[PDB]
Ligand binder design. Structure first.
Ligand SMILES: Nc1ncnc2c1ncn2[C@@H]1O[C@H](COP(=O)(O)O)[C@@H](O)[C@H]1O
Ligand SMILES: Nc1ncnc2c1ncn2[C@@H]1O[C@H](COP(=O)(O)O)[C@@H](O)[C@H]1O
Ligand SMILES: Nc1ncnc2c1ncn2[C@@H]1O[C@H](COP(=O)(O)O)[C@@H](O)[C@H]1O
Ligand SMILES: Nc1ncnc2c1ncn2[C@@H]1O[C@H](COP(=O)(O)O)[C@@H](O)[C@H]1O
Ligand SMILES: [Cl-]
Ligand SMILES: [Cl-]
Ligand SMILES: [Cl-]
Ligand SMILES: [Cl-]
Ligand SMILES: [K+]
Ligand SMILES: [K+]
Ligand SMILES: [K+]
Ligand SMILES: [K+]
Ligand SMILES: [K+]
Ligand SMILES: [K+]
Lengths: 414, 414, 423, 423
């Protein structure tokens, strides 16, 4: 992480002080559970009330121990009598503490992500509603195809971020775990009863099969969801960048006029996407555990959450402040009439007994397009029918016909 | 895909003949829905009863049209009277047909994957139960740590594949969609009523916001799940490869003895993992669609399903036929006594009022380890306690104490 | 690989028949070398003249053996007397044969990639020279900036593809190797002299340190170059797709009008890029070798070369056939005058004692008040400030003179022999 | 980057203070060039002697401007008279400065990577020479195969890291460039002569075709090389982790005994490998540029260089301090005799008129019946078949003679001057 994009409350979660604070919370959870066995009652409460987190001291100890968790434990134990600290870190392996505390950091980080993802959805739906009745040229291969609702662009992103929001809420309900299973998930000293009591104190479920570590596919699953979110961010950023260009000029980022925010967000999306492979590779641990995932996690996890929160907040503000240039958007529809050939062709195919090439050759052969067309049938083919006017109001009625249904099905409230 | 690893029923799903057959099914679904409007009743049934799939003819037409869907439509229409074929491919855009048919191919492919993933879980649980009472050395950093249940290695993989199985079943219940929304999801000719009727015929839900295409994050989500499955396969393959090596020799692949199957599966896992980025990048389509995803999907999707099914079946057979060398596994536990220091140290800490270094210095200072230890306390410290025998039977009782609970919580039936 | 994109001569190289033909050539290279020792003179030549490649037969034998090289060797040996086939596959490990033959397949595949990459370079420069004279609006963040030469767009792709062409030609000179080192690179039966003779017959250098296998970082290096080419393909494809859109419409793909080819090629680029991680992971083999890389290579290597050749040829044809719409391009330059303020600002800064903030209001003054921008500004300068200036006329011709001033130099430094006198 | 792995001299290069100091050097290079035109002689030297780098001040200004280069320029200009600062940042576009200065940061970072990569090569060869004499079991699929030199494990890593060192030194000679081409590479105000003079002051070549930006494939090429190095780091780390495990125990990391360092470095390799895709994607910029690559580069470039330098130094120290357990290694060779059958099979094939299938039963006969394998087989050959052979004794010393026969040649061809007479 760098200062330019640092969200303070997110970096605080991953800072050494909170890292040790969460490990301490996990230590005291199992210590309190063990008060039902050999630990004197009140011990955990006593340590909780006094224990200080001292990262510089931990660092100093680690220079000698060459082991960060031993250094952490030493930094806590040296604040209490030998008697009070006796059962601190008893029966657990270091990673029981590390991985359980890690879940706490992830849990707290997810809370911010989810809040900011909801906020972004709300902004997109607001924008979609605001522009729902603006008619614009839909484009395929970058080429004009048919008119459509401009608002449907924002609604399309809205429903995609909503899909991701459901994924995250599903993971929040069921995703994270803790473990107090000892050296290799074998419960030499601890019991599954101790572990369950500690887990209940922390408010998370127990890993079904832990080893020395919690299996890394849980993290990988979350990071995968974040990868899909990165694609949603990038697709929306790219849409805005396209509409922003001088040639199109249908929107501009609110504040010489450049899409610098959505370009920035494209870069953020690339970063988030690059973490997916790391998380997948960190799963392939040797036997009951290898520590290779540790150094990688120290880099990418704080960055992943920090970039994710930064990006969702920046995208929300960009959407809120985006200027939509209605007249430019709609004049472009006015300026193009090519799509109408297919409309009339279909209309004839549907309302007359003639075939494609026949209906085609007529429309092709052919001031109101509708009028002269309807005149031709009566005059030559002696067929009479009420061909709808295609003037701009008729074009809107035609190409925005189902927009209310599309919004209804996309939004839970409607 | 190559012949060496080709699973026939999977490649058949993605072969041109089934590709066109599914597009035909989708065409007839919307055609039948339109019989509630302008299409004569019985039209879809009439075409269904006669239409032939002719891939060589499609290819021949595409040389002229330069458009595969137009070529496909032409190959169907030229089999019927101009009257019967009149409303074939009416109101839809090409990708309404393509993407909806694609969902059908994915759906049918997923059915095989899910069946083979369930089979692999069953095999792993069977293997875990068979080896549950075999004691082995747990290893951290590749180094002996503490004894544990050998079966817990297979149970660990079992629960991970089970997590993936839930993910896939969740996607199967809710993941795939169809669309009949026209050129840019704007319903110029079709109605949402037509689309819903067609979707009901196909048995899939309607995309909330489609453009010209179905948004590619649905595919990306599935491919992401397959990526996590690849990590599960690789972690299990690596475990087997480790236990298979000449130095350890705790298992061998059933049939000079080499872990060639799990090595093969490691390569398959790499392939599956490489597809994740493709699927994520295919999401970032321009405006209402760009066709760039198409060529990539033509390569990686048939390969992804083909490799996935091949790999899950090969892993199942390898697990079933794996030879577990019990005496080698257990003699290794017998051959090591280092882990016991921590046991006794903890035992003393827990059952006496002495402190770590004191309990440490004793165990360190110290034929039954238990006996002489228990003798020392009575003789010198005048403390009396029933120190459990650590002989091999006692070691098993100690380090497999919670194994029944671990299996119980991991398996729904127990 | 699929039929839709299959380039016949590339898939043929990776087809079972050529795979075994290259294995045979490698087996006969070491066998001929060994004729300097224990093998009767003429043995390799005898087998070379008669042996048939029978992929079908290899398959049925492989059903029994569970080992493809044993199956291949048996398919050869069974065509000869027990005596003649005696020293076939002697001293080598299976992967001495597999990996050395794989180098031959990669070598022949590279020949096609290099020919097609150079041809794409040629077509890009042809397009650059053809359009060097055309003035277009340069764009940053998609927003109009300053006019530039349209040909510089193609020349920018040219130089990038030439950087890749040099990388490939460098690898061609020094990248591929062979090995005849035995089970774990230890030469139990074979000697380094045998290995060297056999390598000389094949025309490739000997791997410095081999194991059972040739190390996979050589393949990974080549695939990494192909990954960089994929970025070049994508950058150029995206440029064409941008220029092809209805809003800009400065080019169209030749032969309703869509950039379907450059979209296809964007897909191809994603595929090529996906292989890089596979190649890098395939490097991490256990000890003296483990066969995990094999299944992976059977999928991605023929696809990588097949897609690369397909994409380079299709992109070249797309560039050749691209229609450049000059009047649309240059009219867009005419329709925009905003960039001129920076020109005039710099002009006043460089030619008056005034300071930037002053010069900026003056230019902002004339611009909103006011028709020749130059002559009017020139008027005020003398009139308001008594300053004598020769401000060049910024009409279309002057604008072209200004913003394409150095285009000759850029072309000359970008193309090696261009700008040298040759005759 | 995090404090735990932060190498001070590398993070300093990427710290705001040096970022702006390099921007200043680039600004003054073009300013000095422009003294041959409109800028009064001495101006660049005046600013060079006095200008202070004030990252703090840049930040407060950037709060207003929303533009980091305007903020930087303003931080410099406000230290001087309006006159002296008049031609500061004249004619250039912001990215002429940013990208040229970025090349200077990359150049200085490369110097450290190259020094540390060569030092790791040195340490690996030192380990290879020290252990060249030790006989170990080679392993394929993790299964015992044939004995080999233990030193060849380290030599195999050596040659791979040397392949990467050559790639980096090649890029160092020809990889980085600078640009002074203006808004879209079009030279509205600047000339190619100005650009060339400024580039000569900086000591880097001019980009052949620049846009607003220098094309990102140069960065991607370097990052791709770093990705290949990451595979080399991982392959070596995994080898040590395998040999360190309790079951094998042939080495341990020097200073309870764990391969914690090589596990850490495996993590570092995964990180380096993750950056390759970022670099490749950053190539695909829209038209004459789009700033999406910027935020990405601010994260991954300092991390890439920081991790690379950290990993190369830590791996070197780990190799230097690695304890090789010779008696364990060689006793394992003594404990295995299976490989000898292939030796004897080949011996009989090469030295008798008998055919393979016959020779195989003979070797299988002596092996199960029977103590010197050689002399006993030699007995049967004369006794059973009346054949006269000098079968070498396959005791420990003979086994060493056989399976390390060519080790001198492998070392000599792997190390350039090794095996040349020098004095
Ligand atoms: N089994 C283990 N569980 C937890 N931490 C460990 C274990 N073994 C070593 N460590 C320490 O964990 C830290 C990992 O450092 P890093 O690789 O920088 O994340 C080192 O300080 C190791 O000493
Ligand atoms: N809007 C569109 N929807 C569906 N298919 C299209 C569209 N435009 C072109 N195609 C055709 O789809 C095919 C894509 O080919 P490929 O890129 O090889 O998958 C080409 O034959 C195109 O002619
Ligand atoms: N050490 C070895 N060198 C070369 N090939 C081998 C070796 N061991 C086994 N094989 C065979 O190589 C083939 C690899 O199959 P696959 O994993 O599908 O590429 C299998 O048929 C194996 O029997
Ligand atoms: N054409 C340009 N060249 C260089 N920098 C720019 C350009 N346009 C905007 N910027 C600034 O560069 C910075 C990029 O921010 P970031 O995306 O965080 O790297 C922003 O402060 C922009 O104001
Ligand atoms: Cl010229
Ligand atoms: Cl030329
Ligand atoms: Cl030597
Ligand atoms: Cl040397
Ligand atoms: K336009
Ligand atoms: K709803
Ligand atoms: K062993
Ligand atoms: K249960
Ligand atoms: K030249
Ligand atoms: K040498």
């Amino acid at each position: 992480m760098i200062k330019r994009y640092d969200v303070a409350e997110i970096s605080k979660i991953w800072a050494d002080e909170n890292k040790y604070a969460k490990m301490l919370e996990v230590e005291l959870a199992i210590l309190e559970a063990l008060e039902d066995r050999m630990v004197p009652k009140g011990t955990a409460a006593e340590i909780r009330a006094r224990a200080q987190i001292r990262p510089e001291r931990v660092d100093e100890i680690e220079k000698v121990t060459k082991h960060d968790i031993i250094a952490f434990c030493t930094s806590i134990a040296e604040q209490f009598t030998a008697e009070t600290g006796k059962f601190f870190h008893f029966g657990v392996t270091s990673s029981d503490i590390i991985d359980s505390a890690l879940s706490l950091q992830i849990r707290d980080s997810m809370s911010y992500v989810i809040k900011d993802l909801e906020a972004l959805c709300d902004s997109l739906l607001t924008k979609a509603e605001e522009t729902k009745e603006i008619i614009t040229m839909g484009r395929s291969h970058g080429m004009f195809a048919e008119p459509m609702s401009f608002g449907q662009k924002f609604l399309g992103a809205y429903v995609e971020f909503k899909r991701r929001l459901k994924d995250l809420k599903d993971f929040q309900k069921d995703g994270l775990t803790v473990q107090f299973s000892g050296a290799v998930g074998n419960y030499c000293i601890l019991t599954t009863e101790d572990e369950k009591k500690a887990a209940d104190i922390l408010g998370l479920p127990v890993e079904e099969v832990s080893t020395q570590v919690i299996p890394r596919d849980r993290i990988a699953k979350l990071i995968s969801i974040h990868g899909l979110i990165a694609s949603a961010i990038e697709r929306l950023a790219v849409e805005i960048r396209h509409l922003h260009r001088s040639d199109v000029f249908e929107v501009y980022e609110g504040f010489k006029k450049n899409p610098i925010s959505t370009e920035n967000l494209t870069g953020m999306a690339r970063m988030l996407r690059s973490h997916v492979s790391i998380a997948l590779e960190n799963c392939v641990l040797w036997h009951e555990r290898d520590i290779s995932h540790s150094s990688a996690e120290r880099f990418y996890l704080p960055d992943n959450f920090g970039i994710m929160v930064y990006a969702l907040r920046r995208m929300k503000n960009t959407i809120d402040n985006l200027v939509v240039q209605r007249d430019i958007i709609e004049d472009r529809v006015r300026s193009t009439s090519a799509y109408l050939s297919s409309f009339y062709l279909h209309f004839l195919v549907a309302n007359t007994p003639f075939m494609r090439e026949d209906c085609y050759k007529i429309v092709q052969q052919v001031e109101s397009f509708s009028k002269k067309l309807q005149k031709v049938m009566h005059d030559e083919h002696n067929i009479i029918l009420d061909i709808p006017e295609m003037d701009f109001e008729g074009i809107k009625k035609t190409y925005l016909k189902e927009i209310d249904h599309v919004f209804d099905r996309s939004v839970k409230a409607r």
